[PDB]
Amino acid sequence: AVQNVADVSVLQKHLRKLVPLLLEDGGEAPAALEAALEEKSALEQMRKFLSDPQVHTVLVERSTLKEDVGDEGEEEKEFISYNINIDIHYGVKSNSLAFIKRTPVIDADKPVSSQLRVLTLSEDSPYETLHSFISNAVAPFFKSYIRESGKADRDGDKMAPSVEKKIAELEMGLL
Amino acid sequence: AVQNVADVSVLQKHLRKLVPLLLEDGGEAPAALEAALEEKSALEQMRKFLSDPQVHTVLVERSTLKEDVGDEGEEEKEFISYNINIDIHYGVKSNSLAFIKRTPVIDADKPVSSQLRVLTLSEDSPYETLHSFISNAVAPFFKSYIRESGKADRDGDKMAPSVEKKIAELEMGLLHLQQNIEIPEISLPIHPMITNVAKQCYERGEKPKVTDFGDKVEDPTFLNQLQSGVNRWIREIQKVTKLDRDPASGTALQEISFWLNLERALYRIQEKRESPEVLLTLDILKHGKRFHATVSFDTDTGLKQALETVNDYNPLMKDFPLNDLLSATELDKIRQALVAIFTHLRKIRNTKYPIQRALRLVEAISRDLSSQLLKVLGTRKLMHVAYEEFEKVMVACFEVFQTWDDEYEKLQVLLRDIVKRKREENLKMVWRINPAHRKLQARLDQMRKFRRQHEQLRAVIVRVLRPQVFDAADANAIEEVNLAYENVKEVDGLDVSKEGTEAWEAAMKRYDERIDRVETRITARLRDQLGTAKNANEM
């Protein structure tokens, strides 16, 4: 929703201070993040994402580009870059951070970081990526909540055991 | 793989920088985090996490503890309480940060954040969250991965498209996500001091006044705290107000429960905010001209329009025949309730309701029928149901289904009436609906057929298979018809699996094989007995 909306500056600065801690494991914002700040297409797409409640998903793809080389027998160097993504895409040799509004309504007064839900992805293998992550994400948490919340004692939705079977077959197929 | 074990300090600093923004839009690594964060209880836990190439889950939370304080003056005191866990579960009144090692042992020399993925926890509705977020995170990503990897190009492995299909099964299979949590009301999430002061000023029975609050009646900090609490309460009631189960993916029982739940909740909240505490709070905040809170509360009700949306009570008019149906165990009562509920549906016309939602509810009714009538027929025990009684009960059930079909047709007429109404606004008018029971009825009707033929196959054996009424072929064929009848009788019954009908069809094509053996025998006896003349026993 749109009653109060966080500014481009504050959100982008938060992202600038946040990303290097992740895609550099505690590094500092590089020139790629500078371009991300200056990227007008990104500058508008993030405004659309923050404003529009139709889509609550956004993606930033710190991309590695095959930089040409002129060295003496040394293969081509890798150059860190940036990409903005309203949708999500199969990143290749390009690390990614996903931000989807945990709180669908958008408010500047509301903690935007606590208004957003954070995921990330480094390109090693999508198969094990999805499998292991959903496994150690929904196997313990979902089962714990359903068992301990008394829902296992509630017949209102026998939907939970069915989707437990669904989760199990998900993990089987993905592994 | 297994590599160097990381140290506490590096990841500790990383998470310390990451948390405070994610938790409360700042905080800059609060010491409450660091107290038990540095504690040996968490320290050995995380040493095991980094070292053991088998554990890949951890849950660091920080509950804003609702510390109940018994001292007079207020109700509760806001508190901070960092929490360490190695397993993940729904933290109550708190959001958490999970961390999954992508490498079974993680080191600092390679980027830790590269070898481990971050999850962050939702306390509002963790299930709806995880569902929607996993969907929006993997399904488009997985589709893009399939397209770029060319999984359709190499058909040697076709399991990735199937896992895409099962991901779709997950996402569109459950949307309710155990919806309709029956939250009818909550406590008062506002300033505690004003509440306790008004409580003590009214328990005396002397009408809590403007002045008894002292300067707090005009204190800017006190009034701002009142506004913040009122805004918290109004946001909570808006959140619970905007809730609406999707008509699909549920059931008519779910819809009626949803309707009644929202009805009683809106009643209790339309009777709750009128408590004198709320009234005096608003009055004394407006005393300092805190008009923003007043206009917000005036406009952020969000329930009025919902109240007229529920002001239709033909809902209950259909609900009662639904209850009769749920209690229905016999076909006559079943389509009696069908007639009544359809009449009430025709009576919904004067009321306002989402048309697509109404259609989805009709489909929910249709397959709820399918289910309960399946239960009824299984009760009838068609497994070895006798011939004539099978025909009788099937005629009954099939004419009840024809009554349902007439109800369906008149419902289409009502849909045309609904389109006539739609002429007032002219939105989408896509119409498509199909109860599964038809397929069920499919099997039903085809079973009637064999029953017919089998009857015809009995007396004629005494007539045509009997020698002019040979004995050896007669005996063989009567034995075969009896045994084939037995096998086809006990092969399937109330069984409603269509593949069960197919197996039955194999059994009856074998039946017809014996029958054609009989046809050959009887035609052979025919022709070898022919040639005499036309009259009677000759032709």
Short mmCIF file of N, CA and C in Angstrom, two decimals, chain B residues 33-107:
data_model
loop_
_atom_site.label_atom_id
_atom_site.label_comp_id
_atom_site.label_asym_id
_atom_site.label_seq_id
_atom_site.Cartn_x
_atom_site.Cartn_y
_atom_site.Cartn_z
N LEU B 33 21.95 -8.13 22.45
CA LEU B 33 22.37 -9.17 21.52
C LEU B 33 23.69 -9.79 21.95
N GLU B 34 24.70 -8.94 22.16
CA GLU B 34 26.07 -9.37 22.37
C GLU B 34 26.27 -10.09 23.69
N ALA B 35 25.38 -9.87 24.67
CA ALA B 35 25.54 -10.49 25.98
C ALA B 35 25.49 -12.01 25.88
N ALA B 36 24.34 -12.55 25.49
CA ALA B 36 24.24 -13.99 25.31
C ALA B 36 24.77 -14.44 23.96
N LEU B 37 25.00 -13.50 23.03
CA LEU B 37 25.68 -13.84 21.79
C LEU B 37 27.10 -14.30 22.06
N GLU B 38 27.80 -13.59 22.94
CA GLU B 38 29.15 -13.98 23.33
C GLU B 38 29.14 -15.10 24.37
N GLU B 39 27.98 -15.45 24.90
CA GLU B 39 27.89 -16.45 25.95
C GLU B 39 28.39 -17.80 25.44
N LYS B 40 29.03 -18.55 26.35
CA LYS B 40 29.54 -19.87 26.00
C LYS B 40 28.44 -20.80 25.53
N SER B 41 27.21 -20.62 26.03
CA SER B 41 26.10 -21.43 25.55
C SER B 41 25.93 -21.28 24.05
N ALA B 42 25.95 -20.04 23.56
CA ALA B 42 25.92 -19.81 22.12
C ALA B 42 27.27 -20.07 21.47
N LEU B 43 28.36 -19.85 22.21
CA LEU B 43 29.70 -19.96 21.62
C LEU B 43 30.01 -21.40 21.22
N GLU B 44 29.82 -22.35 22.14
CA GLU B 44 30.06 -23.75 21.81
C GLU B 44 29.08 -24.24 20.76
N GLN B 45 27.84 -23.75 20.82
CA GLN B 45 26.85 -24.07 19.80
C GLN B 45 27.34 -23.69 18.41
N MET B 46 27.83 -22.46 18.26
CA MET B 46 28.29 -22.03 16.95
C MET B 46 29.63 -22.66 16.57
N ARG B 47 30.47 -23.00 17.56
CA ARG B 47 31.67 -23.77 17.25
C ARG B 47 31.30 -25.11 16.62
N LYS B 48 30.31 -25.79 17.20
CA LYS B 48 29.82 -27.02 16.61
C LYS B 48 29.22 -26.77 15.24
N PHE B 49 28.48 -25.67 15.09
CA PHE B 49 27.88 -25.34 13.80
C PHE B 49 28.94 -25.21 12.72
N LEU B 50 29.99 -24.43 12.99
CA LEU B 50 31.05 -24.24 12.01
C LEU B 50 31.82 -25.53 11.76
N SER B 51 32.11 -26.28 12.83
CA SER B 51 32.98 -27.44 12.73
C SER B 51 32.28 -28.67 12.18
N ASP B 52 31.08 -28.97 12.68
CA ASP B 52 30.41 -30.22 12.32
C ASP B 52 29.88 -30.12 10.90
N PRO B 53 30.30 -31.00 9.99
CA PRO B 53 29.75 -30.96 8.63
C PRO B 53 28.44 -31.73 8.52
N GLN B 54 27.58 -31.56 9.51
CA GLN B 54 26.26 -32.18 9.51
C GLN B 54 25.14 -31.25 9.92
N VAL B 55 25.43 -30.20 10.68
CA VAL B 55 24.42 -29.24 11.12
C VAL B 55 24.49 -28.02 10.22
N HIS B 56 23.34 -27.60 9.69
CA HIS B 56 23.28 -26.47 8.78
C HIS B 56 22.11 -25.55 9.11
N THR B 57 21.66 -25.56 10.36
CA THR B 57 20.57 -24.71 10.82
C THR B 57 20.98 -24.02 12.11
N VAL B 58 20.53 -22.77 12.26
CA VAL B 58 20.75 -22.00 13.48
C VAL B 58 19.74 -20.86 13.48
N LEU B 59 19.28 -20.48 14.67
CA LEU B 59 18.22 -19.49 14.82
C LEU B 59 18.62 -18.48 15.89
N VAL B 60 19.02 -17.28 15.47
CA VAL B 60 19.29 -16.19 16.40
C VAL B 60 18.09 -15.25 16.37
N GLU B 61 17.46 -15.06 17.51
CA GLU B 61 16.27 -14.23 17.60
C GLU B 61 16.50 -13.15 18.64
N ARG B 62 15.59 -12.19 18.68
CA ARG B 62 15.62 -11.18 19.74
C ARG B 62 14.18 -10.77 20.01
N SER B 63 13.58 -11.39 21.01
CA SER B 63 12.20 -11.11 21.38
C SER B 63 12.13 -9.77 22.10
N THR B 64 11.29 -8.88 21.59
CA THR B 64 10.93 -7.67 22.32
C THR B 64 9.97 -8.10 23.42
N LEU B 65 10.56 -8.58 24.52
CA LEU B 65 9.80 -9.28 25.54
C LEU B 65 8.72 -8.39 26.13
N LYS B 66 7.50 -8.92 26.19
CA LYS B 66 6.38 -8.23 26.83
C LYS B 66 6.41 -8.53 28.33
N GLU B 67 7.31 -7.84 29.02
CA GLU B 67 7.52 -8.08 30.44
C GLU B 67 6.34 -7.52 31.23
N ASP B 68 5.52 -8.41 31.77
CA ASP B 68 4.41 -8.00 32.62
C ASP B 68 4.95 -7.52 33.96
N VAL B 69 4.62 -6.28 34.32
CA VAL B 69 5.08 -5.67 35.56
C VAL B 69 3.87 -5.39 36.43
N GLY B 70 3.92 -5.88 37.67
CA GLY B 70 2.81 -5.72 38.60
C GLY B 70 2.77 -4.42 39.35
N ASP B 71 3.76 -3.55 39.17
CA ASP B 71 3.78 -2.27 39.86
C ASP B 71 2.64 -1.39 39.37
N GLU B 72 1.98 -0.71 40.31
CA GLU B 72 0.89 0.19 39.95
C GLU B 72 1.43 1.39 39.19
N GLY B 73 0.69 1.80 38.16
CA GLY B 73 1.11 2.89 37.30
C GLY B 73 0.99 2.53 35.84
N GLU B 74 1.23 1.26 35.52
CA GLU B 74 1.17 0.78 34.14
C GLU B 74 0.89 -0.71 34.16
N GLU B 75 0.77 -1.29 32.96
CA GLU B 75 0.48 -2.71 32.80
C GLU B 75 1.73 -3.51 32.46
N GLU B 76 2.42 -3.14 31.39
CA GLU B 76 3.57 -3.88 30.89
C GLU B 76 4.73 -2.92 30.64
N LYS B 77 5.93 -3.49 30.58
CA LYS B 77 7.13 -2.75 30.22
C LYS B 77 7.79 -3.41 29.03
N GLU B 78 8.10 -2.62 28.01
CA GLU B 78 8.81 -3.14 26.85
C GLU B 78 10.19 -3.64 27.26
N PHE B 79 10.59 -4.77 26.69
CA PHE B 79 11.83 -5.41 27.08
C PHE B 79 12.54 -5.96 25.86
N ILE B 80 13.84 -6.22 26.02
CA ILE B 80 14.68 -6.78 24.98
C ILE B 80 15.26 -8.10 25.49
N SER B 81 15.23 -9.13 24.65
CA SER B 81 15.65 -10.46 25.09
C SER B 81 16.22 -11.21 23.88
N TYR B 82 17.54 -11.20 23.74
CA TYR B 82 18.17 -11.99 22.70
C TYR B 82 18.04 -13.48 23.00
N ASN B 83 17.90 -14.28 21.94
CA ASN B 83 17.65 -15.71 22.05
C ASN B 83 18.57 -16.45 21.08
N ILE B 84 19.15 -17.55 21.54
CA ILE B 84 19.97 -18.42 20.71
C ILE B 84 19.31 -19.79 20.62
N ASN B 85 19.26 -20.33 19.40
CA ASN B 85 18.74 -21.67 19.15
C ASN B 85 19.57 -22.28 18.04
N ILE B 86 19.71 -23.60 18.07
CA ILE B 86 20.36 -24.28 16.95
C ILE B 86 19.34 -24.82 15.96
N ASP B 87 18.09 -24.99 16.38
CA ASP B 87 17.01 -25.41 15.52
C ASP B 87 16.08 -24.24 15.26
N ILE B 88 15.26 -24.38 14.22
CA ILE B 88 14.37 -23.32 13.77
C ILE B 88 12.94 -23.68 14.14
N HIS B 89 12.23 -22.72 14.71
CA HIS B 89 10.82 -22.87 15.06
C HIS B 89 10.23 -21.47 15.10
N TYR B 90 8.90 -21.41 15.12
CA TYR B 90 8.26 -20.11 15.11
C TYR B 90 8.50 -19.37 16.42
N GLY B 91 9.38 -18.38 16.40
CA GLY B 91 9.51 -17.50 17.53
C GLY B 91 8.27 -16.64 17.71
N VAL B 92 7.86 -16.49 18.96
CA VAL B 92 6.63 -15.78 19.29
C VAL B 92 6.98 -14.34 19.63
N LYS B 93 6.26 -13.40 19.03
CA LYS B 93 6.47 -11.97 19.25
C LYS B 93 7.90 -11.57 18.94
N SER B 94 8.47 -12.17 17.89
CA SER B 94 9.84 -11.86 17.53
C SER B 94 10.15 -12.40 16.15
N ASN B 95 10.99 -11.68 15.41
CA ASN B 95 11.53 -12.15 14.15
C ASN B 95 12.98 -12.57 14.36
N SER B 96 13.40 -13.60 13.63
CA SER B 96 14.70 -14.21 13.82
C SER B 96 15.47 -14.25 12.51
N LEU B 97 16.75 -14.62 12.62
CA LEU B 97 17.65 -14.74 11.48
C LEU B 97 18.23 -16.14 11.47
N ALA B 98 17.82 -16.94 10.50
CA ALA B 98 18.37 -18.27 10.31
C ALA B 98 19.56 -18.22 9.35
N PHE B 99 20.42 -19.23 9.45
CA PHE B 99 21.64 -19.26 8.65
C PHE B 99 21.92 -20.70 8.26
N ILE B 100 21.97 -20.97 6.95
CA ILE B 100 22.18 -22.31 6.43
C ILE B 100 23.55 -22.39 5.77
N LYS B 101 24.39 -23.27 6.28
CA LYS B 101 25.70 -23.47 5.67
C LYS B 101 25.54 -24.16 4.33
N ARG B 102 25.94 -23.48 3.26
CA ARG B 102 25.98 -24.10 1.94
C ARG B 102 27.18 -25.00 1.78
N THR B 103 28.16 -24.88 2.67
CA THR B 103 29.33 -25.72 2.71
C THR B 103 29.28 -26.36 4.09
N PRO B 104 29.42 -27.68 4.18
CA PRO B 104 29.27 -28.35 5.48
C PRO B 104 30.24 -27.86 6.54
N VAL B 105 31.40 -27.34 6.14
CA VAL B 105 32.30 -26.64 7.05
C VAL B 105 32.68 -25.32 6.38
N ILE B 106 32.62 -24.23 7.14
CA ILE B 106 32.77 -22.89 6.60
C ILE B 106 34.00 -22.24 7.21
N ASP B 107 34.73 -21.48 6.39
CA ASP B 107 35.93 -20.78 6.82
C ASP B 107 35.81 -19.29 6.50
#
